[PDB]
Design a binder for this molecule. Structure first.
Ligand SMILES: [Mg+2]
Ligand SMILES: [Zn+2]
Ligand SMILES: [Zn+2]
Lengths: 69, 117, 52, 103, 1140
DNA sequence: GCCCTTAGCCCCTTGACAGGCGGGAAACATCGTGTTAACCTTCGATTAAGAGTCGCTGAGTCGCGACG
DNA sequence: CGTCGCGACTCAGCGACTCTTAATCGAAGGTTAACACGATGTTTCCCGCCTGTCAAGGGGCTAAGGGC
């Protein structure tokens, strides 16, 4: 339901908007998304909708997870 | 039995249509490749068994698992699983029968009633 | 045998296929034999032909 | 539309490559070809290509894993060596080549 | 894990280490019991058990034992997966020469010791004996008669020995050493002329350095032990009917085993020397056919008559790693259904049949039922969805809510062919596709099965929502034109809404709001002919604009209200007729100025608006729709009379051309022009109001489905039909499709149209081949660096023919970062900065003043070490935003170049593009001058003037005239190779770009220049090494070598210089660093040998490499994950440096 | 309200089968050998009606000079 | 003061990999010396060891009812 142009202004790469959004959705699977309501939406769509407030915070967690151990 | 003895195995690369595309090798099925669905029931049968065994006695659940093997694939017999717990006698068979008759009620054997098919 | 209807049987029976054993294959045809010669007039239809 | 419709999440797989069969014969799957994989290659959808031709079709050890993960609830997968690459390296190893992985 | 796959020669010891048991009998299974034999092509103890953890003879089939081996059968108990990985080996009684190295284009076995393949092939087949250890009896004398073998041996019976065959060639390869041979060839390559011997010496030195560097011994091309493919790869599954279906490789391996057993029995039996050598020759031929089967006599199977495929035949055709195995994987979780129009759906929502959504989302349905608690177990869930219970449909609509599905059309020519859609559980069994998006798919609804895919992963399900969504694929990757523009119906509706006529009810009746127009139209006071005044907000200046009472129309207001509120847009765009081109420019301007959300919402609204106003309009085609020109019979009679006046006296060809060109080819547009003029005139009824516009004329003018050529063919003169050779028909063809065509004219029509129809089916194959070549030459052209440190760029000049511009300079330069700041002519004012993005505003400012070519940074001038840069590719063609790192720029450009195919066209359009991309010498090879000023005469009596040096056939220059570099003697069709050898690389790139643009404009498919720029850059990845010292390679070489070799030579001193060489798209894989990328689409028997003997290791840097290997692609989301992996590795290294 | 007495359930000891994987012993269907000597001592297909190019070979034409 | 004795020379010539991209339905036809022990498996029951019933008996523990 949420477009990419509305949420790509914060992540002007269009690929970090995918990986970071997937990481945010996975975190929502264990409890996340305290910034925007779900509005009866799936995990990826809600992550893309709330990506306007976790542009840098999501990339750091993904980078830490990519690191071994 | 002499006839029908696989007189000539057809080439698996033979054409299937009017052209030489999509040979017979690309259309043969697999009777040994485990389908992902049948693996799903395997993983859930590993989950649905660990849950039903969590209600039994700890030592009794351990001896029942040793009778078949959930983590260890070495399927032990009655006496072999008997020595691991107590004196190897009919007591192990008795507790196994009691456990087997235990999870046969609609409460414990609820999700397994549609599992055996 | 294309037997979807009585016309398919007739058009399949009256089908001159330039491919098969003894003639050019589907690749062997080329842009030459895939044309219609002037002598084809009256003897072979130029419109009814497979699109593939 | 009946004779042409088709939908097979997981059907009978082949033998030479362990891939899902083609066509609507026996629960086939829409073959994802080189010219149709380039559509996702030019796209940024590399995770799809890392799961559509890696764990979806040609990973006998990864297909069941991804199916169990999807059934459990988590949309996570893993696929390192597809069966296509395995059969390719086995065929190349059949000749005088020394196709062998490392590090 | 694994990475950096490397190939080399398979050592006999390493081959034995790979195998698990030597097969000595050509027996697969038993005729009574279907079990593997002891030692054969299908073995249990050699390749593993046939059943999962079920040993042979029913002894360890309980799975309790995993490493225990049987006693009677000797097979170790293991799952059936090991039967596909376990290899085998056949220790041949005599060696055998590899078919890939013996018989091929480069004779890799003949390059050793400098012996031609014509004699190496004779010494291997035991025809001409070879001499070894000479000491009369010259080295490599190649003697066959027994005179010198026995009669000449009567010199004491000492020091006389020679061999023949595969063993002889193996001993010869063992005798030659790599280091000494390379050292001998080094001095033979330098300090000498090397006129003809250099061509072979270069290849020999390359092969020797590959063998020495890779560590492979020279005597490994001939193999004493042949490895066997595992039995699971070549299966023997019992087919339905008791007839086993054995693979092609099984028969070849059985033949090889039979030959080996026969040779072993002959050697142990002490057979005649002519039969053992003949047995070795038969075994060698069998091993040759088992590998390639093409270089030999094409040995056919004993049962079938089809040519048996081999280990090489599999990889070559589509049925191996090329198409069937690796690239074109038959992915599951997919669906193919006939598509139907989905106008009730949104642009980002495709219809999915309920009967297909269950089979597609079976695991997702199971997960939703398990999490929701509806189903206790997976088996119960499968039993629930299998019967299609009414409670699972509610879960299917809930699971398919934001899970996009990839819609894959049968033919794909660009990245928009795979677009993910939020599925809607529509009734029926057909994919309800959106009307606006099917144009980008190339899928009409006349029958087009759109294969639907479902991404399983959470990232793939999210990757299909950020990039593969239909809302994000508005602008096609070919150029800056939106591909979501209405094709046929919405464009017709908008044209009917925008057509304004001075005569209509409600003239100048001012309305209050937008709803007033519809309220008055429902009352019958105002018509839809767009001639009434009302109020509307245009929003031209900064901020909100007042509701100015515009003098516009009601029909253009219904479309104007759908336009988003933003400056530079409004009713000023709808003031035109709103044709297909104008409506595409409107969807482009709304996306160029406003965002993608508003653009997609306007596209969704206008489709519904155009649909609602097209059905209510009544655009049905009728007999009076196609109006034949009343001034047609007279012009036809006058033309046919003029065709007879000059025919009385008669040259016949001149009179014919006067009667076919000036008589029928001319005045056929006159009749068509008169028809168009009579069709454009709006007939006014007796009540002063025009009756209506012709529906066919509306379709032709709006651009939905009509055209001038189609109009003339339908109602005009129909033109003149073609011929098999291309000549125009001379007979009179005066009849339109509205009238009755007689038999002869219709036969000529179907004689001229079947040629184009075959071109749609034959030239499309050439289009597919060109697209395959481009994506595999441009796969490495991936944007990785955002901004490179380069300043030079290609010059982009607006192409012009005659006196007008063919393409606007503002459009050619739009979306490309400038190299140097463009200076406006006349006044020295910096209109554009040096290294900033060229936005649409910058392009408009540049086009506001007439300017010459502007220095533009392109992918050609990229100084990036790996991949392409971001400040050079410019703007991604997907949207108005600049290109981001990770996009497959090369793949996008290849798709954009292949999209104009199937409608192109010798040298007309498609063949010319294929010739220019492959860089072949045309039929008339042009020779560049390179001389300045005066030009002298060439040598005396050398059949041609090669070149004249003045340092200070057909000819087009004089002997004393002042010639300037650039003017080359040719009648046309220059050569790009000569252009690079004489002229610069940027000049060749500009020539190729202009040629491709001229071709695509003559055909009509506009393609962006950068899409050709990336292909031209990928064609320039090789550079001829002219280094006099430190490197003996003079032929072409990848640029990474001079990036590394030229840097290493400076740390030892001779200066190194290399001129860039241009190779065709097909020749890109010939010298590419990666072999999997080259062995994918190119010939698999030459690139593998070029990579096996060279020990080429695939670093998996490209896109096609990771696709075949299965790992994540280094482009796109995979590119970003690779960057994250690299930064994580750097962080781990920094952390390790902290703790010593 | 607490203590004594008796009944019911749980547990232990023996056991008379029942047959049941499995090697042995045996009766019977395979699988690789031989062996016989009356006459022919070159069998046979299969492209070859489009098309861009890689890898090699072998003919006719010239320079440099020596000996009359 | 010519040529030819003797050398390269590039020119021809000859071989040779692919046929987009998903799809419309599964299998697919021939070749026709005779016999003999032997060593080699194949297949049946038959007891050996052992596994699994339910029962019999009993006691020991637990608990419920009655009396002071
Ligand atoms: Mg269509
Ligand atoms: Zn066994
Ligand atoms: Zn660059």
């Amino acid at each position: 339901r949420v477009t990419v142009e509305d949420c790509v202004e914060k992540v002007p790469n269009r690929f970090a908007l995918v990986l970071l959004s997937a990481h945010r959705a996975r975190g929502i699977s264990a409890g996340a998304a305290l910034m925007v309501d779900r509005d009866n939406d799936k995990n990826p769509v809600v992550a893309l909708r709330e990506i306007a407030d976790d542009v840098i915070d999501h990339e750091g967690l993904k980078e830490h997870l990519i690191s071994t151990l | 039995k002499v006839l029908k003895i696989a007189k000539e195995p057809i080439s698996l690369e033979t054409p299937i249509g009017d052209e030489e595309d999509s040979h017979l090798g690309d259309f043969i099925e697999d009777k040994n490749a485990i389908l992902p669905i049948d693996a799903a029931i395997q993983s859930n049968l590993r989950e649905t068994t660990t849950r039903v065994l969590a209600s039994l006695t700890p030592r009794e659940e351990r001896v029942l698992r040793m009778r078949f093997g959930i983590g260890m694939n070495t399927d032990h017999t009655l006496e072999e699983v008997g020595q691991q717990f107590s004196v190897t006698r009919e007591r192990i068979r008795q507790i196994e029968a009691k456990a087997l008759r235990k999870l046969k009620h609609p409460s414990r054997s609820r999700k397994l009633r549609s599992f055996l098919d | 045998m294309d037997q979807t209807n009585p016309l398919s049987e007739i058009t399949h029976k009256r089908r001159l296929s330039a491919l098969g054993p003894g003639g050019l294959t589907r690749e062997r045809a080329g842009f030459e034999v895939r044309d219609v010669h002037p002598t084809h007039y009256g003897r072979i239809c130029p419109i009814e032909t497979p699109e593939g | 539309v009946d004779d042409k419709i088709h939908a097979r999440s997981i059907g009978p797989y082949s033998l030479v490559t362990q891939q899902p069969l083609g066509g609507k014969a026996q629960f086939g799957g829409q073959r994802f070809g080189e010219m149709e994989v380039w559509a996702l290659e030019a796209y940024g959808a590399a995770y799809t290509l890392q799961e559509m031709l890696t764990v979806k079709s040609d990973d006998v050890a990864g297909r069941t894993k991804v199916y169990e993960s999807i059934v459990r609830g988590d949309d996570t997968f893993e696929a390192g060596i597809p069966e296509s690459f395995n059969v390719l390296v086995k065929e190349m190893r059949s000749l005088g080549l020394n196709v062998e992985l490392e590090n | 894990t694994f990475d950096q796959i490397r190939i080399s020669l398979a050592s006999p010891e390493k081959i034995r280490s790979w195998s698990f048991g030597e097969i000595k009998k050509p027996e697969t299974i038993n005729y009574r019991t279907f079990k593997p034999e002891r030692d054969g092509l299908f073995c249990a103890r050699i390749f593993g058990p046939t059943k999962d953890y079920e040993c042979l003879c029913g002894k360890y089939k309980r799975m309790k034992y995993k490493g225990i081996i049987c006693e009677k059968c000797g097979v170790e108990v293991t799952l059936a997966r090991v039967r596909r990985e376990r290899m085998g080996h056949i220790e041949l009684a005599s060696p055998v020469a590899h078919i890939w190295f013996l018989k091929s284009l480069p004779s890799r076995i003949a390059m050793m010791l400098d012996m031609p393949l014509k004699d190496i092939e004779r010494v291997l087949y035991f025809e001409y004996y070879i001499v070894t250890e000479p000491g009369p009896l010259k080295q490599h004398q190649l003697l066959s008669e027994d005179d010198y073998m026995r009669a000449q041996e009567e010199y004491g019976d000492d020091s006389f020995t020679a061999e023949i065959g595969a063993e002889a060639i193996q001993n010869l390869l063992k005798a030659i050493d790599l280091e000494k041979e390379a050292e001998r060839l080094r001095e033979e390559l330098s300090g000498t002329v090397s006129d003809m011997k250099q061509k072979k010496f270069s290849k020999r030195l390359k092969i020797l350095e590959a063998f020495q560097e890779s560590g492979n011994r020279p005597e490994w091309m001939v193999l004493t032990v042949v490895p066997v493919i595992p039995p699971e790869l070549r299966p023997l599954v019992p087919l339905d009917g008791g007839r086993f279906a054995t693979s092609d490789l099984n028969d070849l391996y059985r033949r090889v085993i039979n030959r080996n057993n026969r040779l072993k029995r002959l050697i142990e039996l002490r057979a005649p020397d002519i039969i053992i050598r003949n047995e070795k020759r038969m075994l060698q031929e069998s091993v040759d056919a088992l590998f390639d089967n093409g270089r030999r006599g094409r040995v056919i199977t004993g049962a079938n008559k089809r040519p048996l495929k081999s280990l090489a035949d599999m990889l070559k055709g589509k049925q191996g790693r090329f198409r069937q195995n690796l690239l074109g994987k038959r992915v599951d979780y997919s669906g193919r259904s006939v598509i139907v129009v989905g106008p009730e759906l949104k642009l980002h929502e495709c219809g999915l049949p309920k009967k297909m959504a269950l089979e597609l989302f079976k695991p997702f349905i199971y997960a939703r039922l398990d999490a929701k608690g509806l189903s206790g177990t997976v088996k119960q869930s499968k039993r629930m969805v299998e019967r299609e219970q009414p409670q699972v449909w509610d879960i299917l609509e809930e699971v398919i809510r934001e899970h996009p599905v990839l819609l894959n059309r049968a033919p794909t020519l660009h990245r928009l062919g795979i677009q993910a859609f939020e599925p809607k559980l529509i009734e029926g069994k057909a994919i309800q596709l959106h009307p606006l998006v099917c144009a980008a798919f190339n899928a009409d609804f006349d029958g087009d099965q759109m294969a639907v895919h479902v991404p399983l992963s959470l990232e793939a399900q999210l990757e299909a929502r950020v990039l593969m969504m239909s809302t994000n694929n508005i602008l096609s990757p070919a150029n800056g034109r939106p591909i979501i523009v209405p094709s046929q119906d919405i464009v017709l509706g908008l044209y009917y809404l925008s057509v304004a006529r001075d005569g209509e009810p409600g003239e100048g009746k001012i309305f209050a709001d937008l709803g007033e127009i519809e309220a008055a139209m429902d009352a019958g006071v105002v018509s839809l002919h767009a001639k009434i005044k009302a109020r509307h907000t245009e929003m031209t200046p900064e901020g909100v604009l007042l509701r100015k009472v515009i003098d516009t129309t009601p029909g253009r207001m219904k479309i104007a209200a759908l336009l988003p509120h933003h400056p530079q847009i409004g009713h000023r765009l709808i003031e035109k007729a709103l044709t297909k081109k104008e409506i595409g420019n409107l969807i482009d301007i709304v996306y160029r100025h406003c965002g993608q959300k508003a653009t997609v919402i306007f596209a969704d609204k206008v489709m519904g608006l155009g649909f609602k106003e097209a059905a209510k309009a009544g655009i049905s085609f009728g007999k009076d729709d196609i109006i034949i020109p009343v001034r047609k019979t007279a012009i036809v009679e006058e033309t046919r009379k003029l065709a007879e006046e000059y025919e009385q006296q008669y040259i016949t060809k001149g009179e014919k051309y006067n009667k076919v060109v000036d008589a029928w080819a001319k005045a056929t547009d006159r009749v068509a022009d008169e028809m168009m003029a009579e069709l454009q005139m709006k007939h006014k009824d007796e009540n002063g109001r025009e009756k209506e516009i012709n529906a066919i004329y509306m379709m032709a003018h709006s651009g939905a489905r009509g055209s001038q050529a189609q109009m003339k063919q339908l109602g005009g003169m129909r033109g003149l039909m073609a011929k098999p050779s291309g000549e125009i028909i001379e007979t009179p063809i005066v009849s339109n499709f509205k009238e009755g065509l007689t038999v002869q004219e219709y036969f000529n029509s179907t004689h001229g149209a079947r040629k184009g129809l075959a071109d749609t089916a034959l030239k499309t194959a050439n289009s597919g081949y060109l697209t395959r070549r481009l994506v595999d030459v441009a796969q490495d052209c991936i944007i990785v660096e955002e901004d490179c440190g380069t300043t030079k760029g290609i010059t982009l000049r607006a192409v012009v023919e005659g006196g007008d511009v063919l393409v606007s300079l503002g459009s050619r330069v739009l979306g490309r970062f400038t190299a140097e700041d463009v200076k406006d002519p006349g006044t020295g004012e910096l209109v554009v900065p040096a290294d900033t993005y060229i936005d649409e505003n910058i392009a408009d400012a540049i086009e506001a003043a007439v300017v010459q070519s502007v220095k533009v940074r392109s992918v050609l001038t990229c100084e990036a070490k790996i991949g392409v840069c971001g400040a050079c590719y410019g703007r991604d063609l997907a949207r108005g935003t600049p290109v981001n790192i990770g996009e497959a720029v090369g793949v996008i450009a290849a798709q954009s170049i292949g999209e104009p195919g199937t409608q192109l066209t010798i040298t007309g359009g498609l063949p010319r593009v294929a010739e220019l991309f492959e860089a072949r010498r045309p039929k008339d090879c042009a020779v560049i001058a390179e001389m300045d000023g005066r030009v002298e005469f060439g040598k005396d009596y050398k059949n041609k003037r090669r070149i004249k040096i003045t340092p200070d056939k057909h000819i087009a220059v004089h002997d004393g005239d002042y010639i300037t570099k650039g003017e080359y003697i040719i009648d046309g069709n220059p050569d790009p190779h000569d252009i690079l050898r004489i002229l610069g690389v940027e000049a060749l790139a500009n020539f190729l770009v202009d040629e491709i643009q001229e071709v695509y404009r003559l055909q009509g498919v506009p393609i962006n220049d950068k899409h050709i720029e990336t292909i031209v850059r990928q064609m320039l990845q090789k550079v001829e090494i002219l280094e006099p010292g430190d490197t003996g390679l003079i032929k072409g070489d990848h640029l990474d070598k001079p990036e590394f070799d030229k840097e290493q030579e400076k740390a030892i001193a001779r200066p190194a210089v290399t001129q860039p060489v241009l190779l065709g798209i097909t020749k890109a894989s010939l010298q590419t660093k990666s072999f999997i990328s080259a062995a994918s689409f190119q010939e698999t028997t030459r690139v593998l040998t070029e990579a096996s003997v060279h020990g080429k290791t695939d670093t998996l840097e490209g896109l096609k490499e990771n696709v075949i290997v299965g790992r994540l692609i280094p482009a796109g989301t995979g590119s970003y994950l690779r960057s994250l992996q690299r930064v994580a590795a750097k962080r781990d290294e920094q952390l390790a440096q902290q703790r010593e």
